[PDB]
Design a binder for this molecule. Structure first.
Ligand SMILES: Nc1ncnc2c1ncn2[C@@H]1O[C@H](CSCC[C@H](N)C(=O)O)[C@@H](O)[C@H]1O
Ligand SMILES: Nc1ncnc2c1ncn2[C@@H]1O[C@H](CSCC[C@H](N)C(=O)O)[C@@H](O)[C@H]1O
Ligand SMILES: OCc1ccc2c(c1)OC[C@]1(O)c3cc4c(cc3O[C@H]21)OCO4
Ligand SMILES: OCc1ccc2c(c1)OC[C@]1(O)c3cc4c(cc3O[C@H]21)OCO4
Lengths: 354, 354
């Protein structure tokens, strides 16, 4: 040997980005939609024809397909052959991963894919070195463009970018519904639920689509909840989560602890344990946020989570918590046990028990 | 289930690019060099101090380190603790993969990493959609910048880029020496070798560094070989490989068949089988080029190879061959058997037998 075997590992990571760009191309070309609409395995020719590609772009289409098939986004099949009796020919089929790229469906993740791999998310890396060696505390995006991501989107010049980003957020909120469908046992025995920082009731409306009989109360700041009303199984309450949280069978904390440091998060968790106190060992607190498990055997899941965490760092200077950090908060808060359920690819739903 | 499990696979590929940018940052920061020069596991503090980072950049350094450690470029170790008696503290060590990033060494691949992940290699992907739907046959780089990669580098404005790219090529040629050291058995029983398209003798000089007694003849076009001379175990010969190749125990074809279509490559291989004919079943032809094995069990190696192949496509519109394609040429040429030896991460050295 010589550990000249280390090259293989070095290069896989160097060129890993190519696979992301390939997926990106697949979605922007609408391949999934083309095949799905076709209703059956599609031939290179047929597909090229559907995409209305110029003859010279057909082999490029072939190249991307081969890489994408090897990566599991398509399955090769051999079919009869171009009519005017049969030659052997390859046909492509969608696989579960690519079915996520079919537009018009509730499961479509095309937008999140488009945004995550948009130039406004990628071009900034050319300033990574300057970013490390400067004295200004800022995001990689600010260091590279001279303005925060938020400001960039709001520029008249970036009308569409702000629109696309906006689509990804809607698509991301919508997915949470699937999260509910896939984990009913989490809300089944509950009579009531308090949605902390539930804004104007968007999330609770989704909960109400799957659990119509659940009495939910949207809790937020006085000025955000205004004086909204109704829906006997839906009520709004204004207040400060750091003072107290309305009592209920369970407390929902969806994307809240992400924005607060430990000291503030601990106080919120403590108030959450109080809101369910009356229900005793029956109550629970539900935390929906990312949980990175470094000791997990699924190394690839952890890499993906850490990758997302790095995007949060370079774009917003934000952070995600590890399983240990989460454990400290939970037990420090006074809870007895907890369970983590993976959701939406790499996110987590955490059931916390007093 | 629901095949909502497909999300995990979809996202891993979406965010795969993050791992490439992280490696990129590691090399530009010179982390490997910092630790290597230190001579022993290095602490976050010590490392931050070595890189002379501003206090606010230390936690970013931490973040990148965690991801890179999980990806195998560093190994965590717990050491005594900051003097003025011990607290427990983490220390980072290089691993084989990162030792490839130590500058000044013959094994350094930093340059190839820097070039492969340079803005001039990445920014062009924002034109991937326009590229697929246009009627002009060109590379993704031409479609995005309005000029070929070659022209771009030669612009006075891109002095340094052309310099960096130039460094990666030298570094890549140099690696071939390691290839020779790691595969002596390939050239051991040879008395003579003909280096087809050996230019002015650069490659043969490397061969002469490991096998000083091997009689090598650099074969190329009359105008390139001019009238070079000497070195009793080194001679130059001008000619046309499509007409004939000087006879020798073995024919070396390093990065030649890559530039020719099958028809031209087959003719070259046939002339190669003739140049070794006199040596009988003892002779051999040595092909150094990429070989993509789709049926290989090492799926990751094939992905890397296909990834590189996609870079060759979008940058130069070039292509690499699969193992089957190579097999067709070899047997079509009239050879009996062949063997493939992986080299330099994802390249191949192919021994062909008459
Ligand atoms: N002291 C406080 N008490 C209750 N809500 C608060 C608060 N301070 C901020 N908020 C609310 O915190 C929310 C954070 S956004 C919460 C996300 C939401 N549950 C979702 O699923 O998308 C905002 O709606 C904000 O108005
Ligand atoms: N008909 C022909 N016969 C021999 N050499 C030829 C040729 N046409 C082109 N070449 C030579 O082809 C070479 C291609 S580059 C070959 C790469 C080289 N062996 C390496 O290891 O880097 C050039 O040096 C070119 O001069
Ligand atoms: O947790 C909320 C949340 C959910 C998804 C995403 C978030 C944040 O930001 C990062 C991201 O990768 C991203 C970056 C973008 C973009 C969309 C986009 O979606 C991805 O448009 C322009 O830049
Ligand atoms: O087989 C020869 C060979 C060897 C390595 C490389 C080649 C070709 O081009 C692609 C590549 O990824 C690349 C692209 C670049 C660059 C360097 C660079 O090195 C990489 O500088 C600017 O753009």
């Amino acid at each position: 040997s010589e550990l000249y075997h280390a090259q293989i590992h070095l290069y896989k990571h160097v060129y890993n980005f190519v696979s992301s760009m390939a997926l990106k191309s697949a979605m922007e070309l609408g391949i999934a939609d083309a095949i799905h609409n076709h209703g059956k395995p599609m031939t290179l020719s047929e597909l090229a024809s559907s995409l209305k590609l110029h003859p010279s772009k057909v082999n490029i289409l072939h190249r991307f397909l081969r890489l994408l098939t090897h990566n599991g986004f398509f399955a090769k099949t051999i079919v009869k052959g171009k009519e005017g009796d049969e030659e052997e020919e390859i046909a492509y089929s969608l696989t579960p991963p690519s079915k996520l790229l079919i537009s018009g469906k509730p499961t479509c993740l095309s937008s999140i894919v488009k945004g995550a791999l948009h130039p406004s998310s990628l071009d900034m890396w050319s300033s990574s070195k300057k970013w490390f060696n400067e004295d200004k505390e800022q995001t990689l995006f600010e260091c590279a463009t001279g303005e925060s991501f938020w400001d960039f989107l709001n520029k008249d010049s970036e009308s569409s970018t702000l629109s696309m980003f906006q689509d990804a957020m809607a698509s991301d909120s919508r997915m949470f519904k699937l999260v509910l469908q896939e984990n009913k046992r989490v809300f089944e025995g509950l009579e009531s639920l308090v949605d902390v920082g539930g804004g104007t009731g968007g999330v609770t409306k989704l909960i109400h689509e799957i659990f119509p009989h659940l009495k939910c109360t949207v809790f937020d700041q006085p000025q955000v909840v205004g004086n909204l009303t109704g829906n006997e199984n839906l009520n709004f309450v204004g207040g400060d989560m750091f003072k107290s949280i309305p009592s209920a069978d369970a407390v929902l904390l969806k994307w809240v602890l992400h924005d607060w440091n430990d000291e503030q998060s601990l106080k919120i968790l403590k108030n959450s344990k109080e809101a369910i106190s009356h229900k005793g060992k029956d109550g629970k607190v539900i935390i929906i946020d990312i949980s990175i498990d470094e000791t997990s055997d699924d190394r690839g899941l952890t890499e993906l989570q850490l990758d997302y965490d790095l995007v949060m760092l370079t774009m917003f200077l934000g952070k995600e918590r590890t399983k240990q950090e989460w454990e400290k908060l939970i037990y420090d808060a006074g809870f007895s046990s907890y369970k983590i359920t993976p959701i939406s690819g790499f996110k987590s739903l955490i059931e916390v028990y007093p």
